[PDB]
Design a protein around this ligand. Structure first.
Ligand SMILES: *[C@@H]1O[C@H](CO)[C@@H](O)[C@H](O)[C@H]1NC(C)=O
Ligand SMILES: *[C@@H]1O[C@H](CO)[C@@H](O)[C@H](O)[C@H]1NC(C)=O
Lengths: 48, 37
């Protein structure tokens, strides 16, 4: 709490809220593609 | 020789670099690749 906290907040740290499938053990994904939950294609931009 | 040439164009967030002794009339060379855990 004395190193990884900022009053402004720390954005240098990120987590993956949504992924299509659960990761296999000891697997690391560094992809920054859009999670296409919807049938309609996000096509690199946010949407419904 | 043209070295790496057209094998790759760019490298992003490269996290690994193992360099060791090279892996490789006819010579049979057999390899088995497994990706487990
Ligand atoms: C690995 O990539 C494949 C590509 O089709 C994907 O379907 C799979 O979900 C990925 N691995 C896991 C288990 O996340
Ligand atoms: C990995 O490389 C991509 C290249 O587009 C970059 O956007 C991303 O911020 C880098 N960092 C990670 C670890 O995702």
């Amino acid at each position: 709490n004395k190193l990884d906290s900022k009053v402004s907040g720390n954005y240098n740290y990120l987590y993956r809220l949504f992924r299509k499938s659960n990761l296999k053990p000891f697997e690391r994904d560094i992809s920054t593609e859009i999670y296409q939950a919807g049938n309609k294609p996000c096509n690199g931009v946010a949407g419904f | 020789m043209e070295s790496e040439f057209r094998v790759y164009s760019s490298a992003n967030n490269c996290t690994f670099e193992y360099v060791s002794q090279p892996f490789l009339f006819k010579n049979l060379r057999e390899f088995v690749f497994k990706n487990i855990d």
